[PDB]
Amino acid sequence: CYLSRKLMLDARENLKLLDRMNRLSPHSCLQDRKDFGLPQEMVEGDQLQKDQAFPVLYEMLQQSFNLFYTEHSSAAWDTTLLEQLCTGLQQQLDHLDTCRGMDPIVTVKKYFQGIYDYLQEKGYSDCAWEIVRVEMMRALTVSTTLQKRLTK
């Protein structure tokens, strides 16, 4: 796709924004353990067809955007980083769509459902969110490695 390189630059910039916001997080929440069962497997061995890679990456990003959009819907009044991250994720989704013309996808949807359920069971607390954003650094990292495969 003519946006291959642009897509990798979108990913790198979203990862940068998410890392910076996590590092500036005003909370000293406890690193107290937590596992979200991210199917890292997908891109760790490239165990999927290209026609399967694309829909899985698109789902990862759409869900990532929905989640940060929801965080934004309730974050502090001027969290400019969160806004930029949402904007950068939407931009990446738009580029992937320009490039356009279920089991693994279901596995992604379950992973993200476990995220919302965790947020729900914690009443969307400030620390429930810091924990989820650190997990999101993992989800965005694996989806970036997958995007590379579709690219390279």
Side-chain angles (χ1 to χ4, degrees), residues 32-53:
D32 257 299
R33 205 68 167 62
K34 215 314 173 179
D35 206 307
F36 290 91
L38 170 70
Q40 285 148 69
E41 310 194 298
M42 57 179 243
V43 70
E44 171 172 350
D46 203 15
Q47 58 192 67
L48 39 55
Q49 276 279 63
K50 159 162 196 170
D51 61 10
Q52 209 162 182

Side-chain angles (χ1 to χ4, degrees), residues 61-102 104-112 114-126:
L61 296 185
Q62 180 73 254
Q63 289 304 316
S64 291
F65 173 79
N66 293 156
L67 184 64
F68 283 114
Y69 188 84
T70 291
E71 192 186 350
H72 172 73
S73 295
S74 45
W77 269 7
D78 187 6
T79 310
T80 289
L81 274 175
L82 181 61
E83 185 133 34
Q84 290 179 313
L85 175 51
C86 285
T87 302
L89 283 166
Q90 186 54 60
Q91 177 177 286
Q92 193 174 357
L93 282 161
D94 291 354
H95 287 145
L96 285 171
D97 276 324
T98 293
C99 291
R100 270 195 179 109
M102 197 176 110
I105 296 172
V106 164
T107 309
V108 165
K109 281 168 178 292
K110 256 182 69 211
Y111 161 80
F112 274 95
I115 284 172
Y116 282 104
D117 296 354
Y118 173 78
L119 283 163
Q120 272 162 41
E121 84 180 59
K122 303 283 180 195
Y124 293 81
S125 81
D126 284 21

Side-chain angles (χ1 to χ4, degrees), residues 105-112 114-148:
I105 296 172
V106 164
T107 309
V108 165
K109 281 168 178 292
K110 256 182 69 211
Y111 161 80
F112 274 95
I115 284 172
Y116 282 104
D117 296 354
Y118 173 78
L119 283 163
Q120 272 162 41
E121 84 180 59
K122 303 283 180 195
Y124 293 81
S125 81
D126 284 21
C127 289
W129 274 116
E130 167 112 81
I131 277 49
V132 156
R133 284 197 276 93
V134 169
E135 167 61 20
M136 282 314 284
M137 255 317 280
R138 278 191 274 293
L140 286 189
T141 289
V142 285
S143 80
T144 296
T145 292
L146 184 47
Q147 183 172 273
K148 220 170 310 179

Side-chain angles (χ1 to χ4, degrees), residues 7-61:
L7 282 168
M8 292 314 302
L9 294 174
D10 288 335
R12 302 202 178 96
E13 183 57 31
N14 297 336
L15 280 173
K16 186 171 192 197
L17 298 166
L18 175 59
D19 177 64
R20 185 146 81 218
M21 101 180 299
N22 288 353
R23 298 187 106 76
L24 295 167
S25 90
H27 328 306
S28 292
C29 316
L30 306 176
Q31 314 178 199
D32 257 299
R33 205 68 167 62
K34 215 314 173 179
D35 206 307
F36 290 91
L38 170 70
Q40 285 148 69
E41 310 194 298
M42 57 179 243
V43 70
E44 171 172 350
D46 203 15
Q47 58 192 67
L48 39 55
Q49 276 279 63
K50 159 162 196 170
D51 61 10
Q52 209 162 182
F54 178 98
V56 163
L57 165 66
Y58 198 90
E59 260 298 300
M60 287 288 288
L61 296 185

